[PDB]
């Protein structure tokens, strides 16, 4: 009988999102809280069934969190603000095989504060579409993100993940080129 951890992280900051909530089973995100619609959103379709939990504490936690950001200005300029440079990693969901549909993944870790924008470029040109970016809290009071991009790899390809630590704090780029592709 192994022991597993369920993480419920309410965090807030001076910036957007001003407040967030993230839940994970071990290391995988279960839900992220949308504070506009005020509902839990499932990371995967199979979790959609429990995103309507109402017996949920959150309001109190949410409010206390913001109260700290607004009341505890008293620290501004007194103690150094914690900041981590974002680290972007790019790779493909499945093994490369030209002409075969795949999806590009850009994993961002060491993000702090959790303020970011992730853009994709194909040969130094903004991509035509886009994919989702799920930010989540991980043990240790730190953050991370996963941005995805569906696509079909071709030999001449060159994609780049541009992660900007908002607003203009720092910008990181991560390149991806198709190498060692699989036979068809």
């Amino acid at each position: 009988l192994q022991n597993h951890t369920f993480l419920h992280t309410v965090y807030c900051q001076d910036g957007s999102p001003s407040v967030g909530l993230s839940e994970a089973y071990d290391e995988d995100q279960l839900f992220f809280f949308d504070f506009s619609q005020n509902t839990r959103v499932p990371r995967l379709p199979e979790f959609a069934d429990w995103a309507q939990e109402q017996g949920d504490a959150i309001l109190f936690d949410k409010e206390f969190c913001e109260w700290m950001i607004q009341q505890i200005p008293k620290l501004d300029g007194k103690i150094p603000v914690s900041r981590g440079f974002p680290i972007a990693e790019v790779f493909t969901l499945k093994p490369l095989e030209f002409g075969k549909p795949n999806t590009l993944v850009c994993f961002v870790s060491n993000l702090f504060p959790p303020m970011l924008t992730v853009n994709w470029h194909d040969h130094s040109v903004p991509v035509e579409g886009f994919g989702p970016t799920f930010v989540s809290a991980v043990d240790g009071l730190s953050f991370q993100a996963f941005s995805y991009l569906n696509f079909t790899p071709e030999p001449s390809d060159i994609f780049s993940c541009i992660v900007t630590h908002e607003p203009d704090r720092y910008t990181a780029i991560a390149y991806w080129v198709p190498r060692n592709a699989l036979p068809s």
Binding site: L1, N3, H4, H8, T9, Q29, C65, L93, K94, P95
Partner: protein, 183 residues
């Protein structure tokens, strides 16, 4: 600045609550946490104390920090689906640009889409296991509850030889074998 009000629930395979946590932090500094024995928020310094006292005055929270029972009831609807969840890996072997070796050929056994992250990979040349290499591989999370790894095998080609990648994962009943031969 950034601030937290993080709660954690430690539950066993069976959904039995083993531990529960409720801590407050500011500037990535864990300031105060709930002490079950003392039934109150205790510092983990002035800010930490002000925050434990400020929260210790709210009886609503004090009665809520029922922490272990909440963990149980809240997770109950889904916990089983999570602790019983598995997805078998897919494996393929192909040649790859050799590195850190003198050998003219390097194979790459790709294993992806599996869950949980634990997996072991071994090679077999003409049915016989080979090389001290860590068979318990570490895996890269895709973020969608699936993982992926790769095991490399450096070698010198011989047309009669048949190398096999042997993958073992809980998401699959029997071990998965993927053969490769020169050309």
């Amino acid at each position: 600045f950034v601030a937290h009000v993080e709660s954690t629930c430690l539950l066993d395979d069976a959904g039995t609550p083993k531990d529960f946590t409720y801590c407050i932090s500011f500037n990535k500094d864990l300031l105060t946490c709930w002490d079950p024995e003392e039934n109150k928020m205790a510092p983990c310094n002035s800010l930490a104390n002000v925050l434990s006292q400020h929260l210790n005055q709210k009886d609503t929270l004090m009665q809520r920090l029922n922490g272990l029972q909440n963990c149980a009831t809240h997770t109950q609807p889904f916990w089983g689906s999570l602790t019983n969840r598995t997805r078998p890996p897919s494996v393929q072997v192909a040649k790859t640009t050799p590195f850190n070796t003198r050998e003219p050929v390097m194979l790459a056994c790709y294993v992806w889409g599996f869950y949980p992250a634990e997996v072991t990979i071994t090679w077999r040349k003409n049915g016989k296991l080979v090389m001290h290499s860590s068979a318990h591989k570490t895996a890269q999370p895709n973020g969608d509850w699936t993982y992926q790894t790769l095991s490399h095998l450096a070698l010198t080609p011989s047309y009669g030889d048949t190398y096999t990648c042997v993958v073992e994962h809980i998401g699959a009943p029997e071990p998965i074998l993927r053969d490769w031969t020169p050309g």
